[PDB]
Tab-separated table of C-alpha atoms and ligand atoms in Angstrom:
chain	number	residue	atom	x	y	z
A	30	UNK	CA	-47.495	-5.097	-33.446
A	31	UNK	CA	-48.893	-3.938	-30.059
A	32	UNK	CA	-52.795	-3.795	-30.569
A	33	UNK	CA	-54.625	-7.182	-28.685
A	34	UNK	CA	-54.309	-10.079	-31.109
A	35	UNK	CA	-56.901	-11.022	-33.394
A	36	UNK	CA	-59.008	-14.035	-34.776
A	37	UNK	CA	-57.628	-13.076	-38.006
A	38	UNK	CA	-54.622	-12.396	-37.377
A	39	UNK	CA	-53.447	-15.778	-35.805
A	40	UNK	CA	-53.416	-18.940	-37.493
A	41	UNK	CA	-55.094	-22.306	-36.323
A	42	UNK	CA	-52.087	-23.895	-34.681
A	43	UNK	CA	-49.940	-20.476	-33.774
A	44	UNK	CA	-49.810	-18.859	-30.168
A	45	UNK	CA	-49.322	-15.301	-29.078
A	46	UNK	CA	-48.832	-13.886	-26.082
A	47	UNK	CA	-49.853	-10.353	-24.563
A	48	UNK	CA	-48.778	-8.787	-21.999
A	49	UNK	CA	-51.262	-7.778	-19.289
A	50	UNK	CA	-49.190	-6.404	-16.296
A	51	UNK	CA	-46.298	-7.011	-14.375
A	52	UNK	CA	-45.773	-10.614	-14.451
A	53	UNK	CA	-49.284	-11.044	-15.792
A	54	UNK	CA	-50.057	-12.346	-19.757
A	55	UNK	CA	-52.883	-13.531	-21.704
A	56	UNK	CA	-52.803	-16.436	-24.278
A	57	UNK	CA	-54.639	-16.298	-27.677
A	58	UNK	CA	-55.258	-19.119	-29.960
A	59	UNK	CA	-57.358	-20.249	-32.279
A	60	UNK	CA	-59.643	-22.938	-33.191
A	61	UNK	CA	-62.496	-24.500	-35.544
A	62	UNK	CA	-65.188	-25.862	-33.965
A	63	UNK	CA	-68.217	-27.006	-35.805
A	64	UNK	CA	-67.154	-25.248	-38.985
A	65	UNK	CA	-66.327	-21.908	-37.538
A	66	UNK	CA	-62.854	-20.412	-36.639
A	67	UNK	CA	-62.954	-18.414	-33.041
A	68	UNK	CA	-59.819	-17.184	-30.852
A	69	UNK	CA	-59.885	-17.981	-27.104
A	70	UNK	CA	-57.752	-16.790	-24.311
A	71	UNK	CA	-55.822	-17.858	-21.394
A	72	UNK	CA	-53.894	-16.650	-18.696
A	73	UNK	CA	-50.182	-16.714	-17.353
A	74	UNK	CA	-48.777	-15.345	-14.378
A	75	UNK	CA	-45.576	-15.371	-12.758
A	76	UNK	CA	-44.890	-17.440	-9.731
A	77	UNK	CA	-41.532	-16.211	-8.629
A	78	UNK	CA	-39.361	-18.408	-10.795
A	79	UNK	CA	-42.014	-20.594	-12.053
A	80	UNK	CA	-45.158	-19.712	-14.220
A	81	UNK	CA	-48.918	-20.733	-13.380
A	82	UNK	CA	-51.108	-21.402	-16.542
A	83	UNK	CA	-54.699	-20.802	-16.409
A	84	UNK	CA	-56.538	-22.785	-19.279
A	85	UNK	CA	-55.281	-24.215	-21.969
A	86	UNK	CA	-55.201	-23.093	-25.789
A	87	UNK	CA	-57.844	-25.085	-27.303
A	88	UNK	CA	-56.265	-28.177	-28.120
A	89	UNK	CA	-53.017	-30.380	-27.814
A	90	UNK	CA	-50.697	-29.316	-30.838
A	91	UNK	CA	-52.315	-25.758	-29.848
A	92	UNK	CA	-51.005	-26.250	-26.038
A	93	UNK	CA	-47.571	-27.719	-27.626
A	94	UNK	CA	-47.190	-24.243	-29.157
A	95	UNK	CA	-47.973	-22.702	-26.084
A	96	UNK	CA	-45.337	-24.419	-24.080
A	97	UNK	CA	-42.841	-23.105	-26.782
A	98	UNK	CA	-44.478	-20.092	-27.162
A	99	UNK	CA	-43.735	-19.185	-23.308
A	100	UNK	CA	-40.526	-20.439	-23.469
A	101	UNK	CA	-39.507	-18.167	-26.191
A	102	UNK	CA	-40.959	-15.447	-24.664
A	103	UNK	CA	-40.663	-15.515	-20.955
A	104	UNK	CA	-38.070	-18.161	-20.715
A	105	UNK	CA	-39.501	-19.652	-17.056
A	106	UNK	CA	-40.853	-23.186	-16.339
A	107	UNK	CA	-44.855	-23.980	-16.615
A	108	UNK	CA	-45.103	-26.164	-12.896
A	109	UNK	CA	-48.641	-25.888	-12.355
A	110	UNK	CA	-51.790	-25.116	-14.595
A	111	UNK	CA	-55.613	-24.670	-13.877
A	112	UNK	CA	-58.653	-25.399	-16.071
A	113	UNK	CA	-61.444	-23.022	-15.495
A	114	UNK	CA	-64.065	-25.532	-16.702
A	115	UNK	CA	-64.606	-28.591	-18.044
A	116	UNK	CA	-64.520	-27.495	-21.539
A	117	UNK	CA	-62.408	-28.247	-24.916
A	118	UNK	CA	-61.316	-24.446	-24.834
A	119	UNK	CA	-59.740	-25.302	-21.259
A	120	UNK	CA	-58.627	-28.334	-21.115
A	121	UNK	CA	-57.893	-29.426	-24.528
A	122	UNK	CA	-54.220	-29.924	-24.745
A	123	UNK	CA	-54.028	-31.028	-20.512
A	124	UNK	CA	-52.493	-34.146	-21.583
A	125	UNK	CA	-49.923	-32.479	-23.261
A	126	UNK	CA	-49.186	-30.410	-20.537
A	127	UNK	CA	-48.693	-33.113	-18.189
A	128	UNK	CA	-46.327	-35.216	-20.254
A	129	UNK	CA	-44.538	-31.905	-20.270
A	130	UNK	CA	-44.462	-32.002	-16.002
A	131	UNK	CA	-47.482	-29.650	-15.910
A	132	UNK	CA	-49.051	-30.511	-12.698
A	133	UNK	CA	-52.950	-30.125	-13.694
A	134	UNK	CA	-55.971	-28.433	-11.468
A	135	UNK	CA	-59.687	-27.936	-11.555
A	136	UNK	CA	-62.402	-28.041	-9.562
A	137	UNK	CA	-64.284	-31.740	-9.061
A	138	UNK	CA	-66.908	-30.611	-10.940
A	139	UNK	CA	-64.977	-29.527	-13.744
A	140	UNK	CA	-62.958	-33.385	-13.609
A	141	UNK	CA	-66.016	-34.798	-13.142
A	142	UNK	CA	-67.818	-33.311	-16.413
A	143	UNK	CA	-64.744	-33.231	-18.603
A	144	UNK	CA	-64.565	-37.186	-18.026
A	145	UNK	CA	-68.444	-37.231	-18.328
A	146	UNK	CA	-68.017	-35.884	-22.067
A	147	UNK	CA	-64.583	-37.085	-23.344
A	148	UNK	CA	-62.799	-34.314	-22.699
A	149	UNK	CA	-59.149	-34.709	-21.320
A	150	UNK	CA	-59.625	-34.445	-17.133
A	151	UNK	CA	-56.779	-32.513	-15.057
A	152	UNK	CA	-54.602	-34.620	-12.342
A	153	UNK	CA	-55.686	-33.112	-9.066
A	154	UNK	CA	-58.735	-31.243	-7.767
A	155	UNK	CA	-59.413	-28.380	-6.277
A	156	UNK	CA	-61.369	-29.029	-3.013
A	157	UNK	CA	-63.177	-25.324	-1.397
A	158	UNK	CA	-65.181	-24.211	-4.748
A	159	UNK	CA	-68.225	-25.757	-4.548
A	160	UNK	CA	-70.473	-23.209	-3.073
A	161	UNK	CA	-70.976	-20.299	-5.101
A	162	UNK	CA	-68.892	-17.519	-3.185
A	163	UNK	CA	-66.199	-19.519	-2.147
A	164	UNK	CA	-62.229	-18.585	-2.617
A	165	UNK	CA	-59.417	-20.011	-2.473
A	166	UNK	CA	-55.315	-19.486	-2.755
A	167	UNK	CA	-53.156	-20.994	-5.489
A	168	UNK	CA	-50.153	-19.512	-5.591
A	169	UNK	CA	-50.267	-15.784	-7.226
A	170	UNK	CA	-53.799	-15.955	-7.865
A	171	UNK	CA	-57.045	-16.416	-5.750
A	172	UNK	CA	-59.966	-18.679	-7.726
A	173	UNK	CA	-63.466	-18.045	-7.248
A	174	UNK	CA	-66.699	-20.069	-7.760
A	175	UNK	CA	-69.228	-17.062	-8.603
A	176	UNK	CA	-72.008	-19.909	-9.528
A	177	UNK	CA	-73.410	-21.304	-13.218
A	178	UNK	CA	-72.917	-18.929	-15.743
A	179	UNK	CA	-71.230	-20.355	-18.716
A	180	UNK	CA	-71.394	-23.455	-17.676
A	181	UNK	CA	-72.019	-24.617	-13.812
A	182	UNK	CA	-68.674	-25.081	-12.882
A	183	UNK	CA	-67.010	-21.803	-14.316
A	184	UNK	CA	-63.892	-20.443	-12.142
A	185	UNK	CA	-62.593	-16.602	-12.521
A	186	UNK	CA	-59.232	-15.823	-11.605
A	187	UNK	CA	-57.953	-12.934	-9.595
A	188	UNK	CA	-54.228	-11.195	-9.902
A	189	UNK	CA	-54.804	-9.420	-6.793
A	190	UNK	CA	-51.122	-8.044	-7.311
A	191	UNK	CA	-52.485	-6.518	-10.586
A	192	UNK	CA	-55.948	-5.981	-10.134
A	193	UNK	CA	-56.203	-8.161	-12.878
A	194	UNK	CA	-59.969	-10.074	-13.410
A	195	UNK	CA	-60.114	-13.404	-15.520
A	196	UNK	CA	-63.147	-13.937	-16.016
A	197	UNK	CA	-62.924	-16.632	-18.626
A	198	UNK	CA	-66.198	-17.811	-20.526
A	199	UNK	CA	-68.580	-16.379	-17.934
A	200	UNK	CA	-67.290	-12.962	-19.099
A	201	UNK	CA	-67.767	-11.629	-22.751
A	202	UNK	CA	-65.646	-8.955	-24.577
A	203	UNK	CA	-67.369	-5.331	-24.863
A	204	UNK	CA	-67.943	-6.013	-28.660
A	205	UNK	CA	-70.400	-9.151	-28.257
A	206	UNK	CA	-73.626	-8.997	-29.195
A	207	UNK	CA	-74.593	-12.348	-28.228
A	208	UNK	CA	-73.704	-14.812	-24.999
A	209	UNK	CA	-71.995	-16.798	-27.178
A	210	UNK	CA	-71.957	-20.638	-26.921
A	211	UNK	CA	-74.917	-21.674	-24.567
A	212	UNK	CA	-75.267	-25.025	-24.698
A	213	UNK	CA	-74.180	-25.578	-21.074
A	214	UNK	CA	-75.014	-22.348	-19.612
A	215	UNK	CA	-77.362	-21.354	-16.885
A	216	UNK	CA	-78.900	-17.861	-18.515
A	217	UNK	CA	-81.452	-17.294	-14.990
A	218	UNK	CA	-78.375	-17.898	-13.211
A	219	UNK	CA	-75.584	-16.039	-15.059
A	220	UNK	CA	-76.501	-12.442	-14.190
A	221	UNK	CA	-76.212	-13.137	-10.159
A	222	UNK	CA	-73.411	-14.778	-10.441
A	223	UNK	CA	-71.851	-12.069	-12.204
A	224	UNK	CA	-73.283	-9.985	-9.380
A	225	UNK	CA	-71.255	-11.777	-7.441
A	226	UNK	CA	-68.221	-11.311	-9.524
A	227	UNK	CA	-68.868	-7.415	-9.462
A	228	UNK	CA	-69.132	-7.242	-5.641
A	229	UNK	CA	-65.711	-9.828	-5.247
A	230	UNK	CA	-63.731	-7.629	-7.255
A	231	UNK	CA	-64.870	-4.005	-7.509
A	232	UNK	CA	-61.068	-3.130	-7.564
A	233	UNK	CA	-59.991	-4.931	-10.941
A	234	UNK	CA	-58.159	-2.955	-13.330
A	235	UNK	CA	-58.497	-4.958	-15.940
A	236	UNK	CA	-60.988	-7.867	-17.012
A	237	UNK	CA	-59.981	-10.537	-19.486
A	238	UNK	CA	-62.990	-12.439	-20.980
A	239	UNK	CA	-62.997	-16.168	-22.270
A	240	UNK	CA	-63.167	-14.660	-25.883
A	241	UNK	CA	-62.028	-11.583	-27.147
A	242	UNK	CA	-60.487	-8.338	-26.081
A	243	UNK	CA	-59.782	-7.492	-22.299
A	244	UNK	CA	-60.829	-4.113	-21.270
A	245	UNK	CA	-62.318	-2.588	-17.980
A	246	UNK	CA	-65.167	-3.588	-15.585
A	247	UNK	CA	-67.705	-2.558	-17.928
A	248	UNK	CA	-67.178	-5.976	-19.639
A	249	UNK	CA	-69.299	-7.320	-16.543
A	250	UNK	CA	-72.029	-5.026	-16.738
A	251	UNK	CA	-72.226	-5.800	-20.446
A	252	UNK	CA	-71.753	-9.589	-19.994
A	253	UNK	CA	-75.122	-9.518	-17.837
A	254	UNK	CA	-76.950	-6.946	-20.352
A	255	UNK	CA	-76.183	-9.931	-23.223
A	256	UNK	CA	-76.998	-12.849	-21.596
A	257	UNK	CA	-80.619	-11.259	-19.542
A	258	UNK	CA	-81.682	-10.314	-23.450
A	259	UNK	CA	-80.354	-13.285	-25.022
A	260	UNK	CA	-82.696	-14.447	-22.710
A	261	UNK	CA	-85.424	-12.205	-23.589
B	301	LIG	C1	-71.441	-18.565	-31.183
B	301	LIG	O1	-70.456	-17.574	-31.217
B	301	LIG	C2	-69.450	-17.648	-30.241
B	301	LIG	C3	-69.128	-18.817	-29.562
B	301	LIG	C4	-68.112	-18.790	-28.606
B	301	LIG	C5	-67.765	-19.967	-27.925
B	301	LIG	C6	-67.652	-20.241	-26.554
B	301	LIG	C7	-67.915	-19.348	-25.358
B	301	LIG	O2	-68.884	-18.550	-25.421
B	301	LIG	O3	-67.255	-19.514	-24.301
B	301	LIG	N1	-67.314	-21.500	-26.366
B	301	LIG	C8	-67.173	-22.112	-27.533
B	301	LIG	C9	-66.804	-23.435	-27.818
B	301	LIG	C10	-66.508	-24.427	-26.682
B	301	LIG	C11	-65.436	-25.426	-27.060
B	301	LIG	N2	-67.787	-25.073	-26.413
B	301	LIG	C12	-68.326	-26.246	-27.016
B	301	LIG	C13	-69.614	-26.533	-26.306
B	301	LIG	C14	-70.735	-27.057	-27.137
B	301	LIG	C15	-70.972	-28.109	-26.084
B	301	LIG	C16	-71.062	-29.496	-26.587
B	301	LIG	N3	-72.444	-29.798	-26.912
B	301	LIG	C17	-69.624	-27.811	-25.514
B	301	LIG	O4	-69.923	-25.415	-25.505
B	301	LIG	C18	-68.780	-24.561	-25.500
B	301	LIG	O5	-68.663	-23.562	-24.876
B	301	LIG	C19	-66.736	-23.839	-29.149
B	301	LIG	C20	-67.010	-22.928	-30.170
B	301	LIG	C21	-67.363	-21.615	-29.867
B	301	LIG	C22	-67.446	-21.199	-28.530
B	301	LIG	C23	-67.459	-17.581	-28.378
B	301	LIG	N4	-67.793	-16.481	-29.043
B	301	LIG	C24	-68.751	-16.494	-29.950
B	301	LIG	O6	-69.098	-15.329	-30.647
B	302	LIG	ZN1	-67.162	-23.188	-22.503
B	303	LIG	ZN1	-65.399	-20.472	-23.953
């Protein structure tokens, strides 16, 4: 009924929508993964008559109710969608989207590690991201390469029409107390690439993490205070 949606409060297999700004949303779902139940976002933003997804929502019969879950609410065609690393959280569900006509994105590295580890690989890549600083266009949004955080080939996403900051799994909600899932992350790394983050963006309105509740720029101030004592 308003408030940001919840682990909670959505079923495994249900999708809800938020919206974020003018032509801007976030997608929550959720998902179990090794015997726990966690939500994960995702983006959507409007591309004049046509929608770009960023990520999908953990999973294929997830992504299905995505698809229908847009279509209910915004009523405009998914044409093009972007996987901000190689991860199930992200690309789980790309074949679905491209049986649907979802033309499918990510960096090489991302293809190249989601194939590496059985995880379904997006159609086309997206050359210019492999040094970290680098930017590039795609349509409403501009993707950046800030370096290994998360995992080495994380991507944030910038609204600039919005102000609006995706940071995906290389940014944590205010409320985490830990740096979550580490397994592929690069913890020496992750605080200067947030740096980098902070000085890309030091307009953004709003910053959406991988997990949890969007807020404010604090969430990247907070995402490096985590991970340097998770560290610790
Ligand atoms: C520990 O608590 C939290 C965890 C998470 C969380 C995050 C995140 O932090 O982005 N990602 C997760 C993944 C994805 C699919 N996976 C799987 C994996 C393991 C490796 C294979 N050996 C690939 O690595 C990864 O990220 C699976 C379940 C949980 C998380 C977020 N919030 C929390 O509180
Ligand atoms: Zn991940
Ligand atoms: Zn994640």
């Amino acid at each position: 009924s308003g408030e940001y949606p919840t682990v909670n409060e959505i079923p495994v297999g249900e999708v809800r929508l938020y919206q974020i700004a003018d032509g801007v949303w976030s997608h929550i779902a959720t998902q179990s993964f090794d015997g726990a139940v966690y939500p994960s976002n995702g983006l959507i933003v409007r591309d004049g008559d046509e929608l770009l997804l960023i990520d999908t929502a953990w999973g294929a019969k997830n992504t299905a109710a995505l698809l229908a879950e847009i279509e209910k609410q915004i009523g405009l065609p998914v044409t093009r969608a972007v996987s901000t690393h190689f991860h199930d959280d992200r690309v789980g569900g790309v074949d679905v989207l491209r049986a649907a006509g979802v033309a499918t994105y990510a960096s090489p590295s991302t293809r190249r590690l989601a194939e590496a580890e059985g995880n379904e690989i997006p159609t086309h890549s997206l050359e210019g991201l492999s040094s970290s600083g680098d930017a590039v266009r795609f349509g409403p949004v501009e993707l950046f390469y800030p370096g290994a955080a998360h995992s080495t080939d994380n991507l944030v996403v910038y609204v600039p029409s919005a102000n609006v900051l995706y940071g995906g799994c290389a940014v944590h909600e205010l409320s985490s107390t830990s740096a979550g899932n580490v397994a592929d992350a690069d913890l020496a790394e992750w605080p200067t690439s947030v740096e980098r983050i902070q000085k890309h963006y030091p307009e953004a309105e709003v910053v959406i993490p991988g997990h949890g509740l969007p807020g404010g720029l604090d969430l990247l101030q907070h995402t490096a205070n985590v991970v340097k004592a998770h560290k610790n």
